[model samples]
Target chain A: NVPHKSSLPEGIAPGTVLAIRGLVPPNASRFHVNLLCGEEQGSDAALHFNPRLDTSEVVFNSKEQGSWGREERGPGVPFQRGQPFEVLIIASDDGFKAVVGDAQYHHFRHRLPLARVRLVEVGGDVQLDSVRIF
Target chain B: VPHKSSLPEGIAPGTVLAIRGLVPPNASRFHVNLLCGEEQGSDAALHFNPRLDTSEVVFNSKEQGSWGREERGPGVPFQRGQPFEVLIIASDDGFKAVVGDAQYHHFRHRLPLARVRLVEVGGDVQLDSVRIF
Candidate 1:
């Protein structure tokens, strides 16, 4: 389990690879994961993952205006809440690769580079059990 | 009073002028305002205003990670607990100017361009009023 801290774990620097495993509680329409970096001590960084609305059963980045609201994908295809799931996030030079389950969700590039990363925060209503980095 | 819907006030375009007046009620700490424009429908835009914490007798943008927590800015500065105030947000081609009660807090620019804005949204908690144009 990754401890929550204002700063990221020590020894985990730029270019490091990290993996997160957790079960998203039922009815959780969306989730947010951030790989923060910058001289402003995580303050001046970018938000890497924010997958809130996906209607196709396929994970996709939000591309619409009204899509921001917490809604369902389709009839009988509501979010698989409380279902066991694993999300893999790989840090890149300019961004992070987000893979949800077996499918490659999307490649989220950072507005800022990784050279400025100082911390990583991974905790929310979601039950995150472990975060492994190599 | 501002209308509730998508897309900005039709009369205005890029580099246009706009104002917002509202009452941030009791126990409210921060509010959000956006001047979004881009090829993307306000989705690929930058969040221009997010003032959640302030310890002094002034309004300020969040500067800390832990500060992201919804807590008191300071002992007494606990957000003027619902009163009256005016916020002026002027849009430039690349960014927007944010002025909160005579104090020029900061300036936020677009991550993209105004040539593409297709919509806008203005509704949330701690909101009692608004004006868009």
Candidate 2:
């Protein structure tokens, strides 16, 4: 699949929301949704939302100074292969409310202020139809 | 608090906010503001409000603690307890709104839109989902 990249449109602010609609590839192994503070190679990501299929789990982390932060795990994988999925991410002062489809899949707290995040990078085994930010 | 959400990039030409919800029956007042910052008294780029006494949907802006002229409607287009969808699209000039299938309105910019990104909806209606584009 093609890597989808775009800026946050409004950057990352509390109360901001991003929705991604796509279908999982039947042979998918993993996928990621990242909120980067900047697009540079070493700038860092404010939030890394990675979902791994084999284990049915999501790993949340952050990167700063070219280093990855401690990993946080979601309750479980809410995205199934060979099926359509919609992810809704709402930015809060403390963290992000991530809903997979219509279910609350995880609550990922921030490692840094959301205001610093700028870009949206999504990639892996999914056919994305739309990525919206508001 | 009925609801308040921030627009990360404000409302640029492609910015859009779509709300699926229900307007309170016989509601007295409701307002949705496309604002600039999250602080108290932050400037507003556009304010769309509906007041029951006049049953007119008004649009305007706020700056230096004073609101500009009010713009009214072609007759109240909302129904009590009725399901409705609100679509707001951002443009360089201003904002445009379409309610249900019949209601339509447009507002032009009164101030520069740079840094304008917060959106807040308060009073009356029950909101379900606020989608961004």
Candidate 3:
């Protein structure tokens, strides 16, 4: 079961952007934000942006037909512990770009069809303050 | 804020409270509290907080608006992004919390278990059911 999951009033497509604001607790280990194709808890995820505080890195991947794809470890900025963060996941013609705080976090090329993404789910050790999409 | 429900019949020794829920993938903390009343600021007879980030569970009680000493222990049996069932069994001396086959902790009675009239759950969890027997 998902604690926070929402289907966008309008489905995702090229030029869509999802913005989230949250706080990472001092002892956080990991959390994930997903762009998914369906509203079910087990639906396929087009992009899974996971931040692991234990490993001090971000992981990117997709889930399709109940199986997760190969993980891509991002090489850019990592989230700061015990601090507020603003993340923007912007979709374009080819892929998604993650911008955290004011820096580029990573680029995740589309692994699943972006046109099918209808919902966004946020979970884990972060205190989510707000979520907005445009 | 948490979801609150009535206990109907107050607890006694040998009573068992069962809770089924799923830990959200991004969960940092969640708590289940047994309260003396349903009103806001009601005294909590048992405050069971699982701090996932710290790998510990903290137990305490609030009586007459004052908090008691906290008892923290290792061995968090909850898994993030997975469903779990927790059983809180009351005995003559204390309450024992169990997850599946693993005994998580025993919180000694600070307030009488009979004082528990409400059960409240909140934070980073999707609760499926709460049953008392």
Candidate 4:
């Protein structure tokens, strides 16, 4: 269930980065962050980023016409247990790039029109400390 | 004190160090040092030095009492007349700096990352805030 959602002061243009500071609960199982193109409809997503605690991988996906599309998975646990986590998600030419703490983690092709993304929703097993979209 | 600061002991990987503020009008020189241990001595793996001593910003890597060289930015990123944002992302390779337009990374070595003691900043500046992620 989503417990975080906010509107962006502006649209995400190329090179735009979404910075999030948070923590992973020791007993956490998973968490996901979403850049929603249409929230009320809740069926259109520009980017779907999910990190599963049970898996050492981060899964990326999108949605259109209320249908889920193909999923993209990458190696490594993006957040560490008992440690402060900072994530940077950048909007590039045709995809999104993520930086876990300091190093580059993953990048995925545009799952939807990038400009349509204005809402960010974060939820599950994570405690957000701060967030900024620039 | 002299505005001296240090990050957590053994600053873990996936850790972040942010020094946000501005340069004082008259003060023009400063350095951000990361260590495997102490400074003013040995184990300085990476040093971000601003030489208002000459209007240039430099990086250096030192191991123990030995190896490591100095690198200077073509110009200065810390100066007057403009407000700027500087960030150093921490990683195994070193302090990770991302190029905005090009979208790549440049890791400045402080030599033996042996124990990367703490993320520190000292000299010629004011601190508005400090953040760790």
Best by lDDT: 3
Please identify model 2 stretches exceeding 4 Å from their true place. A1-134
Q: Which residue pairs in candidate 2 have backbone atoms (N, alpha carbon, C) closer than 3 angstroms, thus clashing?
A: A10-B8, A10-B9, B10-B117
Worst 10 residues of 3 chain A by lDDT: A68-77
The chain A TM-scores for the candidates, taken one by one, are 0.62, 0.93, 0.93, 0.91
Off by over 4 Å in 4: B1-133
Best by TM-score: 3
Q: Which tens-of-lDDT digit does each residue in B1-133 have in candidate 4? A: 2444454456665665666544545566777777665456647767777776588777777665674666766555555422334566777766764322221335654454556766667776554345557
lDDT per residue, candidate 2, A51-74, as tens digits? Answer: 878557687777767655556778
Identify the leading candidate in terms of DockQ: 1
Better of 1 and 4 by TM-score: 4
lDDT of 4 by residue, A15-123 (tens): 7888988988788877888898765855488888988775455777776665555566777676766777999999998899988968988888996888888789998
TM-score of the candidate numbered 3? 0.52
Q: What is the DockQ of candidate 4?
A: 0.01
Question: Candidate 2: what's its TM-score on chain B?
Answer: 0.90
For model 2 the TM-score comes to 0.49
Interface root-mean-square deviation (Å) of every model: 13.2, 20.5, 11.5, 21.7
The deviation in Å at residue B35 for candidate 2 is 1.0
Clashes of each: 12, 3, 5, 4
lDDT of 3: 0.83
Q: Give the runs in model 1 whose Cα sits over 4 Å from its true position.
A: A1-3, A6-15, A38-42, A53-79, B1-133
Give the per-residue lDDT of model 2 (tens digit) for B10-127: 5558777887655654567778887788888988878888776567889889986789998876667665545568888887787778888554888888877776878888877666
